[PDB]
Design an enzyme around this catalytic site. Structure first.
Site, PDB file in Angstrom:
ATOM      1  CG  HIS A 155      -1.826  -1.124   1.230  1.00  0.00           C
ATOM      2  ND1 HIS A 155      -2.542  -1.438   2.373  1.00  0.00           N
ATOM      3  CD2 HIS A 155      -2.433  -1.901   0.174  1.00  0.00           C
ATOM      4  CE1 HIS A 155      -3.253  -2.703   1.951  1.00  0.00           C
ATOM      5  NE2 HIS A 155      -3.267  -2.996   0.623  1.00  0.00           N
ATOM      6  CG  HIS A 159      -7.743  -2.217  -1.273  1.00  0.00           C
ATOM      7  ND1 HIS A 159      -6.879  -1.349  -0.750  1.00  0.00           N
ATOM      8  CD2 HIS A 159      -7.126  -3.269  -1.506  1.00  0.00           C
ATOM      9  CE1 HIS A 159      -6.053  -1.764  -0.051  1.00  0.00           C
ATOM     10  NE2 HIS A 159      -5.849  -3.233  -0.533  1.00  0.00           N
ATOM     11  CG  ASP A 185      -3.848  -4.435  -2.928  1.00  0.00           C
ATOM     12  OD1 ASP A 185      -3.343  -3.576  -1.952  1.00  0.00           O
ATOM     13  OD2 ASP A 185      -4.653  -5.375  -2.319  1.00  0.00           O
ATOM     14  CG  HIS A 245      -0.839  -9.247  -3.633  1.00  0.00           C
ATOM     15  ND1 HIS A 245      -0.712  -7.780  -3.530  1.00  0.00           N
ATOM     16  CD2 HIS A 245      -1.738  -9.454  -2.602  1.00  0.00           C
ATOM     17  CE1 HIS A 245      -1.507  -7.032  -2.768  1.00  0.00           C
ATOM     18  NE2 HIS A 245      -2.152  -8.151  -2.233  1.00  0.00           N
TER      19      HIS A 245
HETATM   20  C1  LIG Z   1      -7.520  -8.264   0.142  1.00  0.00           C
HETATM   21  C2  LIG Z   1      -6.112  -8.806   0.128  1.00  0.00           C
HETATM   22  O1  LIG Z   1      -5.853  -8.738  -1.377  1.00  0.00           O
HETATM   23  C3  LIG Z   1      -5.256  -8.240   1.130  1.00  0.00           C
HETATM   24  N1  LIG Z   1      -5.701  -7.809   2.207  1.00  0.00           N
HETATM   25  C4  LIG Z   1      -5.464  -8.654   3.326  1.00  0.00           C
HETATM   26  O2  LIG Z   1      -4.643  -9.568   3.254  1.00  0.00           O
HETATM   27  C5  LIG Z   1      -6.089  -8.411   4.547  1.00  0.00           C
HETATM   28  C6  LIG Z   1      -6.629  -9.520   5.193  1.00  0.00           C
HETATM   29  C7  LIG Z   1      -7.441  -8.887   6.466  1.00  0.00           C
HETATM   30  C8  LIG Z   1      -7.441  -7.720   7.174  1.00  0.00           C
HETATM   31  C9  LIG Z   1      -8.395  -7.636   8.187  1.00  0.00           C
HETATM   32  C10 LIG Z   1      -8.872  -7.284   9.099  1.00  0.00           C
HETATM   33  C11 LIG Z   1      -9.782  -7.320  10.535  1.00  0.00           C
HETATM   34  C12 LIG Z   1     -10.440  -6.996  11.322  1.00  0.00           C
HETATM   35  C13 LIG Z   1     -11.435  -6.970  12.757  1.00  0.00           C
HETATM   36  C14 LIG Z   1     -12.590  -6.017  12.524  1.00  0.00           C
HETATM   37  C15 LIG Z   1     -13.361  -6.150  13.640  1.00  0.00           C
HETATM   38  C16 LIG Z   1     -13.054  -6.681  14.971  1.00  0.00           C
HETATM   39  C17 LIG Z   1     -11.682  -7.312  14.916  1.00  0.00           C
HETATM   40  N2  LIG Z   1     -11.358  -8.172  16.028  1.00  0.00           N
HETATM   41  C18 LIG Z   1     -11.088  -7.843  13.741  1.00  0.00           C
HETATM   42  C19 LIG Z   1      -6.869  -6.751   6.410  1.00  0.00           C
HETATM   43  C20 LIG Z   1      -6.195  -7.088   5.174  1.00  0.00           C
HETATM   44  C21 LIG Z   1      -4.287  -6.871   0.325  1.00  0.00           C
HETATM   45  O3  LIG Z   1      -4.956  -5.795   0.682  1.00  0.00           O
HETATM   46  N3  LIG Z   1      -3.210  -7.142  -0.322  1.00  0.00           N
HETATM   47  O4  LIG Z   1      -2.786  -6.100  -0.742  1.00  0.00           O
HETATM   48 ZN   LIG Z   2      -4.286  -4.217  -0.502  1.00  0.00          ZN
END
Ligand SMILES: C[C@@H](O)[C@H](NC(=O)c1ccc(C#CC#Cc2cccc(N)c2)cc1)C(=O)N=O
Ligand SMILES: [Zn+2]
Ligand SMILES: C#Cc1ccc(C(=O)N[C@H](C(=O)N=O)[C@@H](C)O)cc1
Length: 300
Positions: free
Chosen positions: A79, A238, A242, A265
């Protein structure tokens, strides 16, 4: 002559790491010409450097990471990396006193302001672009991504979401890149995840910095975030954030047409390496004449 750029001053911000849930201090530094983008861990002693390189990328379950010779890692770089491309930063040292870059609000936007604070400093050395000369395609099952010759930088992203909270009207985003377009259309799009999966990881001691403050979270049926989405198509937005971050892992702006179907990715990077591996498929170019510069890559 279109010159390489770095930061004017050192700046620093603080945030929580997605993995550890711990406070992480981030420090951005100016750097000399041609040194490129460098991520550095200062929690380790001595500090470890991770030059941004398509080959050193590993797509972990959560976000992405860089790897060195010994498999030491620095995580969640993509990011911030996207914001680097957005504001046209070529050389920079990025330090964290932890194993990861802070997740912030799940988007690139907090990094935009941080870089703005650091200012831009033009170095007396030509900025090199990677100009696509041939069509290059890579696939993974029904998934595919390709780069095609084109005097500019465009991205055409389509992702298969089968979720009830993501409409068919919002599976596709396409744009002609530009610092302005990135900051206003893309930078604020947050990452997302499935709530049960996250619950599970956090029960296993992982993803400890995960919260509503750092990601869009959905159960089987709906977005759980009180305030909803920043855009109706924030998810695909998003994914393009990415993609921009993935592609900029080579440290150069690419002149061409990016097109992707259900890409991520792994596949974005697979395309990047495929392109760089084929000598005839591309070439470096510099602009003595500033007006020759493609629209997409003009300063912000
Ligand atoms: C989409 C994918 O490609 C990737 N994203 C991730 O791997 C990822 C995976 C999980 C989270 C998260 C969370 C949360 C929470 C939460 C909310 C309320 C209460 C509680 N206890 C916890 C964020 C990003 C990416 O962006 N790569 O660039
Ligand atoms: Zn991302
Ligand atoms: C660690 C870990 C871990 C990684 C991935 C999953 C997963 O695929 N969950 C499934 C799901 O469909 N999630 O959206 C179903 C099972 O909910 C689950 C756990």
């Amino acid at each position: 002559m279109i010159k390489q750029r770095t930061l004017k001053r050192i700046v620093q911000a603080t945030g929580v790491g997605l993995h550890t849930g711990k406070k992480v201090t981030l420090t951005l530094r100016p750097a000399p010409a041609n040194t490129g983008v460098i991520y550095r861990r200062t929690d380790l002693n001595p500090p470890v450097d991770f030059p941004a390189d398509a080959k050193s990328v590993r797509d972990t379950m959560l976000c992405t990471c860089l790897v060195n010779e010994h498999d030491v890692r620095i995580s969640t770089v993509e990011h911030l990396n996207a914001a680097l491309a957005g504001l046209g930063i070529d050389n920079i040292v990025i330090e964290v006193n932890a194993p990861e870059i802070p997740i912030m609000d799940g988007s690139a936007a907090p990094f935009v302001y941080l870089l703005l604070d650091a200012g831009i400093d033009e170095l007396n050395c030509a900025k090199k672009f990677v100009r696509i000369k041939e069509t290059v395609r890579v696939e993974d099952g029904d998934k595919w991504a390709e780069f095609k010759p084109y005097n500019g930088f465009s991205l055409d992203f389509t992702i298969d979401f089968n979720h009830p909270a993501i409409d068919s009207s919002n599976q596709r985003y396409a744009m002609n890149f530009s610092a302005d377009a990135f900051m206003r259309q893309i930078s604020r799009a947050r990452t997302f995840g499935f709530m049960r999966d996250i619950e599970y990881l956090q029960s296993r001691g992982l993803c400890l910095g995960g919260s509503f403050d750092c990601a869009i979270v959905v159960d089987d049926y709906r977005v759980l975030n009180e305030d909803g989405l920043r855009f109706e198509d924030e998810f695909v937005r998003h994914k393009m954030l990415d993609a921009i971050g993935d592609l900029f892992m080579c440290g150069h702006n690419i002149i061409g047409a990016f097109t992707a179907y259900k890409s991520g990715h792994a596949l974005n990077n697979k395309l990047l390496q495929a392109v760089l591996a084929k000598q005839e498929a591309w070439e470096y170019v510099t602009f003595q004449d500033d007006a020759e510069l493609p629209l997409a890559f003009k300063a912000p």
